[PDB]
Amino acid sequence: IRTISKIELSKIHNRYNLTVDFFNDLNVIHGKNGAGKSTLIHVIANIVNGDFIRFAFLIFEEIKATYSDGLKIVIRRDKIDEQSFISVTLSNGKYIKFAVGEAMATVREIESMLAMDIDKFVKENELQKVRASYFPAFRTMLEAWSYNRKASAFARELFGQFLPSINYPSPMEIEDRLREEIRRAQLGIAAYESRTFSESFVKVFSTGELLKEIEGLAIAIKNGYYAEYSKVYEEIRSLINRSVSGALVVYRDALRDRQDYQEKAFSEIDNYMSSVNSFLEDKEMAYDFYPKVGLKFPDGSWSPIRVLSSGERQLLTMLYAASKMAIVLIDEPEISLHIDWQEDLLKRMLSQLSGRQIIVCTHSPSIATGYEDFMINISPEFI
């Protein structure tokens, strides 16, 4: 759809300029500390998500960014009559101008009409069609503050008000979310079982291989929320252990559809568990049973999710928000990861994220391996 390509930064923080040519695919920005990596991500997130009010808290001159479809947003900051006046000029000629002190008053107020004006502007011009998700580099703090909404306020307090909105899970919130997903999946399986019984009763009213197939289907954990239906299926298996093929066709189809809906309702949780357990060595993450999500050692012991190290916590927070996803802006994915996981994390997340623009910023080049043709070295232009 629309992918940022040419982004030009003029005199950001009143000290340096920058010009970045992006691709629609993965972009591995490699630079040492001080190259303005995370200011480029804050600028891109505030431009794409439509939070132009945050641009009142940055001291710049001209921030013009061109998308892939030709559309270009130019943000200008001027000082007229000792008042900082900032204008968002589009390529259609419709430009919204607003005062920095008015924006500051608005921000303090929320903790309105100006924000409504910005919202109306971006809405009528469709400037928020494609959203951007920001994976912050300070995501270890999000565990300490336990998506929540006060975390954005705290991070703006200790980072400045230019920071975009933060919606990133913590290694304690993912546990709760997974428990909810398991319970809801059970409820959906029970709903499908009740609907299957209601349709089957009227349907069944209306060949040893069929009996064979029925025995194989009923021989096989992942059970519905209603225990009476589990007793029904166990009674079916016992009757299997203990012409008329028209009813048997409906019975076989009901059992096959029961197993298929059981596998379909657990698709996301099994995909996330497989993606996590591909990384882990001598340790496995599972949800074996009240639902309970934890870690299963190969010795058979069961331990909670507190016991994971820093790298495993980073993989849990990173692979979960990648699944629940647009443009993904990842800041520093190499925190507390050794070389073997750094050489494969980008490949695993690209398996998770397909058809979306990926912009990552790294200090170690071990993230950039396997996709080394997409590296964009960055050097600020000091003035």
């Binding site: 319970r183 409820l187 709903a191 209603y226």
Partner: protein, 106 residues
């Protein structure tokens, strides 16, 4: 196809508006019983329609009021009571603006 929580809440909203229009509730005191009268008729009562509503988003699966949950082992009645509690909680948000719309109606 399936029944979600939002369809049940819309049905409860329509029933509460009808109760306000018919019984002529003027203040919050009559609406304190009208909300229960509207809520207990919007709970599903056919098993399938209860599990499908509980499996949808917008409604949690725990009782904030432990005394509202009946002390019985019938799971489906527990889920119906949970639906009733969540319906009362969500209708208490719209009760004030429904009263204001009824006052502006006359």
């Amino acid at each position: 196809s399936n029944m979600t929580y939002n369809n049940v809440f819309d049905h409860a909203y329509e029933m509460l508006k009808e109760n306000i229009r018919y019984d002529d509730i003027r203040d919050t005191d009559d609406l304190h019983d009208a909300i229960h009268m509207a809520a207990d008729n919007a709970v599903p009562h056919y098993y399938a329609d209860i599990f499908s509503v509980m499996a949808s988003e917008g409604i949690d699966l725990e009782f904030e009021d432990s005394g509202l949950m009946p002390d019985t082992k019938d799971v489906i009645r527990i889920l119906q009571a949970r639906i009733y509690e969540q319906l009362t909680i969500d209708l208490w948000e719209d009760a004030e603006d429904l009263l204001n719309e009824y006052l502006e109606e006359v």
